[PDB]
Design a protein around this ligand. Structure first.
Ligand SMILES: CCCCCCCCCCCCCCCCCC(=O)OC[C@H](COP(=O)([O-])OCC[N+](C)(C)C)OC(=O)CCCCCCCCCCCCCCCCC
Ligand SMILES: CCCCCCCCCCCCCCCCCC(=O)OC[C@H](COP(=O)([O-])OCC[N+](C)(C)C)OC(=O)CCCCCCCCCCCCCCCCC
Ligand SMILES: *[C@@H]1O[C@H](CO)[C@@H](O[C@@H]2O[C@H](CO)[C@@H](O)[C@H](O)[C@H]2NC(C)=O)[C@H](O)[C@H]1NC(C)=O
Ligand SMILES: *[C@@H]1O[C@H](CO)[C@@H](O[C@@H]2O[C@H](CO)[C@@H](O)[C@H](O)[C@H]2NC(C)=O)[C@H](O)[C@H]1NC(C)=O
Ligand SMILES: CC(C)CCC[C@@H](C)[C@H]1CC[C@H]2[C@@H]3CC=C4C[C@@H](O)CC[C@]4(C)[C@H]3CC[C@]12C
Ligand SMILES: CC(C)CCC[C@@H](C)[C@H]1CC[C@H]2[C@@H]3CC=C4C[C@@H](O)CC[C@]4(C)[C@H]3CC[C@]12C
Ligand SMILES: CC(C)CCC[C@@H](C)[C@H]1CC[C@H]2[C@@H]3CC=C4C[C@@H](O)CC[C@]4(C)[C@H]3CC[C@]12C
Ligand SMILES: CC(C)CCC[C@@H](C)[C@H]1CC[C@H]2[C@@H]3CC=C4C[C@@H](O)CC[C@]4(C)[C@H]3CC[C@]12C
Ligand SMILES: CC(C)CCC[C@@H](C)[C@H]1CC[C@H]2[C@@H]3CC=C4C[C@@H](O)CC[C@]4(C)[C@H]3CC[C@]12C
Ligand SMILES: CC(C)CCC[C@@H](C)[C@H]1CC[C@H]2[C@@H]3CC=C4C[C@@H](O)CC[C@]4(C)[C@H]3CC[C@]12C
Ligand SMILES: CC(C)CCC[C@@H](C)[C@H]1CC[C@H]2[C@@H]3CC=C4C[C@@H](O)CC[C@]4(C)[C@H]3CC[C@]12C
Lengths: 516, 516
């Protein structure tokens, strides 16, 4: 009955994952039929787009425009549409992440030094990723996800949610750095590619738009589970909380004529960036020069790292999204979701388009957007394939809707990314126990991990996860940021060796409960 | 036992009000001995000062600097110190208001037209106010305050609290009007008396500082009756909520070097503004020219209006402050508080210094600052004379502490005035019933005015007060703003004639309850 279990046959998991979810494919399509879903499409679109614009820029400037915005938008769309209509957990938002950006930057520096064609080099990384995932799905290597306890999920879920907030602020800090509050400004300033000199009222209006969008979003979330207005209208106005928050603040910026703000820049059309270097289809043997033999066999060793990055990235997100406390009746297919994400990424490499992973904050936010509330607890979750599809489609059609996106500020969306960061710490027992460090022992939740276990022991456990978070934060900040998945895997030994010595088995049953 | 009752003897109320409160004068002084009180002194100081700076400016520019900041600061201090050590309800904050400003502007225009000495003219207004209050206190004319039902108190309390918020925003709107968000600015701009041309980052930083101070104050108020940190520390950090909110935001502005913000401007020393025209002591018969006879008898007719303005201003504030739902054990003396406020104002006129009234928002905020909370409901109220004294003293010594006040922005204090406006709508059944218009009939407080009385009837009553508010708002906006007290008195006939026809006696007992 459980999804994580080793079957005798080869490709046994993939078969059982299909026969589980595909009978509900009609019901899935019809689960989209509600206003929450439309509000979820509109919300998660900007959550899906803005990274594909941001990382698209970061790839472009870094990798001499071999991978850019045009490539990443098309990649995120095609892989998003395929995964929405096939993937066993459609709530998983397939997009490009920080850990993947770091690899492309690292692999480019490696290709640049040795004297190799980068875009061609990636094709052979992809060829191994097609072999390595099919090898794992054959023997059901996703059975290792069984041993990823709440411990590892909570640390990852919290680490990523904290980093996502630190990301959102550093963008705002960069505006104040580029556009400082000076006494005097250069009045005649070009903004052809971007403001050259500092501008007046740009950094503060950015701070205003961010603070405003975050406020409206958080106050309309409060309004949803309030007791004001009819229950029919209240939930509709609440579900369209972020859509209204963006609409208000985009119009606030629209009526401000003279003062400048940074807005969503998309490509002219659907052209590969730097057409002089590469086309659409990347020739494995080489575009210009003869790509050598030793790399075509030694493309496994980078692909092995890329696999671990995506595998730990995607499958831990699947546990967090398809958690028993979240009312997920349809199910979750770990073998099939791994096959598509990594498989399509390997095929995407052939077209010089970035491989993607199930992004945690985007996926959790997508589930949280489609989760209902009553009385408070979860009744069901609106689990469809159309929200996953429409988001991917709109990210594909993003360039054709440049005139609409051109009027939307970034400072507005930074308010929404702050919301996505705050909101993602909802059902995280770790974060809940960080709050209980500051609460005195009189005011506690009255739940097994505080009642069964002593306050001294509970804070010691909570204390180790802070030590564990602190290590993982240092690992990212240091040059070895691609090793963070291997340091996150090392949290499982900790739970299954070190803690059982220091702690009793009765307490870990409650502290690190498989289900709340 | 009740304070509002007509005794046989002359000056009967004044005697009974003294014999009530003065036995607790030792206990009053010792009721100051707590951290809430220090936090209340610091909070209400800026609430007391900034109007005496603002109206001080408005008097100065209007009345050719005959009344100014120097006059109003000294007047607010001396009358504040005397009232703190004598006044039967020390929580009443004696200061200058909008209605009094409008009269001084109107009386100056009258004096200017006819050809009379204004500052001399006020002395004879004051001479009548000394006679007219002592005549009222003799016959116990404060017995008319008995008939001011919750109806009239709630409308006034809400009208004044709404106007105080509209006041706070219009100041912020004036900054954006004077310092607009333009593409280009004049770089070389003098600020000798004040910024001549528009400045960059002034209006938005003002909006930031206001939004920030309001946020910190409202979040530290939430923290006070939260369940985080020790109960000993939590209430102390909470009680010093506004002091911390100002300290944070004043330091935020301090570390911003180059960009300009408007700060608390106080006089050079203790010198009367426009010394050429007037001295300290105003000669009744005239300073320069012969002040005529007809005015010395016809100074009653303006003084009669000034009396009604202060009498309705002060005594309705006394009902709101000394309300039965607020745990006021010490008592409240309506006859003695009327005598001091109007009497000292009449004596203050002799020194060319403005007469004052018990200001509603400042008084309510002062009581709310000294009110404790448990579990939520009120246990007791820290009712002392030292908070009233220290505020008055600090407003007196404000000019000697110019270097401290010079670094404090106005935009910061606008955040605190927004807090004072929001916070003042706490125990107002009217405002509570405005919220119940938007709530559906399932989610209601379960209290006599919603349970005994039907929702149709309850919203009709709530509806009349909105019609009543709308009239009182139009009355202020129109030139006849000094008639608003007489239109507020007209709400008592409404309750005792019109409503008893349209409504049943059983419903008014609950809707318009003397006590909750
Ligand atoms: C419980 C939590 C508490 C914390 C809550 C904090 C929430 C954060 C909210 C942030 C504010 C969002 C609104 C931004 C508005 C910016 C307006 C602007 O820059 O336009 C200038 C506008 C833009 O129009 P313009 O540039 O065409 O101006 C042309 C003017 N002439 C021709 C004269 C040059 O310029 C003006 O100054 C026009 C004159 C009118 C003045 C307009 C200013 C309005 C400001 C009101 C703010 C109201 C909200 C404040 C709430 C804060 C406290 C809760
Ligand atoms: C509920 C949601 C709504 C709540 C709203 C509450 C209000 C929030 C804002 C309050 C804080 C205001 C800080 C003003 C910063 C002014 C800029 C400054 O320091 O000068 C730049 C200074 C200029 O001053 P300078 O001259 O001393 O600096 C040196 C200048 N250079 C570099 C050229 C040599 O420039 C910098 O050096 C950049 C440093 C980065 C500082 C940026 C701080 C950003 C503030 C973020 C606050 C978080 C709030 C986010 C909103 C959501 C709520 C969490
Ligand atoms: C676009 O691609 C071209 C072609 O590779 C890049 O040009 C190379 O990179 C830099 C020039 O910027 C030189 O060091 C190399 O010698 C160039 N080689 C070739 C084959 O031209 C260029 O960097 C890319 N431009 C961007 C940033 O889009
Ligand atoms: C001080 O007060 C005097 C008295 O009004 C002001 O001097 C007058 O200015 C008005 C215009 O506002 C003229 O109509 C009068 O003729 C002036 N009277 C005189 C000569 O005193 C003065 O403007 C005020 N300002 C100062 C100097 O402090
Ligand atoms: C482009 C950016 C700035 C904002 C875009 C958000 C737009 C598309 C959102 C914001 C509010 C939304 C509306 C909110 C409520 C409803 C009622 C529902 O019964 C039908 C959809 C409808 C009518 C929504 C349509 C989409 C909507 C207009
Ligand atoms: C996306 C691409 C690159 C993936 C390629 C992997 C191939 C080898 C996979 C994908 C789907 C798989 C099939 C899915 C289902 C079944 C039914 C089962 O009873 C026997 C195996 C069989 C027939 C699988 C064989 C292997 C298979 C064909
Ligand atoms: C339309 C919905 C369903 C899918 C969203 C993505 C669409 C718009 C994207 C994905 C890949 C894109 C194609 C990629 C490459 C090219 C070659 C170029 O020389 C012309 C445009 C063309 C032919 C693009 C057309 C639009 C396209 C099909
Ligand atoms: C991040 C680095 C610098 C610090 C490591 C995390 C800190 C915050 C952790 C590590 C050990 C923890 C302590 C371990 C045990 C106890 C006893 C308990 O009865 C109260 C909490 C208290 C006192 C914990 C507070 C938080 C703590 C101090
Ligand atoms: C800061 C400017 C704007 C106004 C002046 C406010 C000053 C005097 C306020 C702000 C914060 C206050 C402190 C806050 C908390 C405490 C703890 C309490 O157990 C003793 C008093 C003490 C130590 C306060 C002393 C006075 C204080 C320092
Ligand atoms: C701390 C409490 C008791 C007092 C607060 C207010 C004090 C400081 C103020 C109120 C009125 C003030 C006086 C008003 C008028 C004058 C005349 C002037 O030519 C010299 C200063 C002098 C003599 C002032 C001295 C200080 C004073 C007495
Ligand atoms: C804004 C100023 C100028 C006047 C407007 C007053 C409005 C808000 C008042 C006046 C009378 C009121 C109505 C009186 C009675 C009822 C019946 C009740 O079952 C539903 C609410 C309803 C329908 C009220 C809604 C609010 C109402 C319409």
């Amino acid at each position: 009955d459980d999804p994580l279990q080793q079957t005798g046959q080869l490709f046994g998991g993939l078969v059982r994952d299909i026969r589980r979810r595909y009978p509900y494919y009609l019901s899935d399509i019809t689960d989209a039929f509600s206003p929450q879903v439309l509000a979820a499409v509109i919300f998660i679109y900007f959550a899906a787009l803005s990274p594909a614009i941001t990382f698209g820029g970061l790839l472009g400037e870094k990798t001499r425009n071999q991978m850019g915005v045009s490539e990443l938008l098309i990649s995120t769309a095609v892989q998003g549409i395929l995964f929405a209509l096939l993937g066993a957990q459609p709530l998983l938002v397939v997009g490009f992440s920080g850990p993947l950006l770091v690899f492309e930057e690292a692999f480019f520096s490696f290709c640049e030094t040795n004297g190799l064609e980068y875009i061609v080099g990636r094709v052979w990384i992809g060829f191994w990723l097609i072999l390595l995932v099919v090898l794992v799905v054959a023997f059901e290597g996703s059975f290792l996800v069984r041993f990823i306890s709440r411990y590892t999920q909570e640390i990852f879920s919290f680490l990523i949610s904290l980093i996502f907030i630190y990301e959102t602020f550093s963008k705002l800090i960069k505006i104040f750095q580029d556009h400082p509050l000076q006494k005097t400004y250069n009045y005649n300033v070009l903004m052809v590619p971007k403001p050259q000199g500092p501008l007046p009222n740009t950094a503060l209006l950015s701070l205003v738009l961010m603070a405003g969008t975050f406020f409206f979003a958080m106050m309309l979330r409060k309004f949803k589970n309030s007791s004001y207005f009819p229950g029919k209208l209240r939930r509709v106005i609440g579900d369209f909380g972020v859509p209204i928050s963006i609409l208000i603040m985009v119009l606030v910026d629209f009526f401000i004529q003279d003062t400048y703000t940074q807005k969503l820049s998309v490509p002219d059309g659907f052209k590969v960036s730097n057409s002089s270097a590469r086309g659409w289809v990347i020739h494995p043997l080489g575009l210009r020069s003869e790509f050598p033999i030793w790399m075509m066999f030694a493309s496994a060793l980078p692909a092995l790292l890329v696999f671990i990055l995506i595998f730990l990235e995607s499958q831990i997100t699947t546990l967090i999204v398809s958690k028993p406390e979240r009312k997920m009746v349809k199910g979750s297919g770990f073998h099939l979701d791994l096959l598509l994400v990594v498989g399509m990424g390997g095929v995407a490499a052939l077209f010089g388009m970035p491989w993607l992973s199930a992004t945690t904050v985007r996926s959790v936010t997508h589930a949280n957007a489609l989760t209902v509330m009553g009385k408070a607890q979860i009744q069901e979750v609106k689990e469809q394939r159309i929200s996953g599809l429409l988001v991917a489609v709109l990210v594909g059609l993003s360039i054709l809707m440049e005139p609409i996106l051109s009027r939307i500020p970034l400072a507005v969306l930074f308010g929404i990314f702050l919301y996505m960061g705050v909101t993602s710490l909802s059902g995280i027992q770790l974060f809940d126990r960080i709050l209980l460090l500051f609460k005195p022992p009189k005011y506690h939740p009255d739940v097994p991990y505080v009642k069964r276990v002593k306050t001294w022991r509970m804070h010691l456990f909570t204390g180790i996860q802070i030590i564990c978070l602190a290590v993982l934060w240092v690992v990212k900040s240091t040059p070895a940021s691609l090793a963070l998945p291997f340091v996150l895997i090392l949290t499982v030994p900790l739970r299954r060796v070190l803690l059982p010595l220091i702690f009793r088995n009765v307490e870990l049953q409650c502290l690190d409960a498989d289900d709340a």
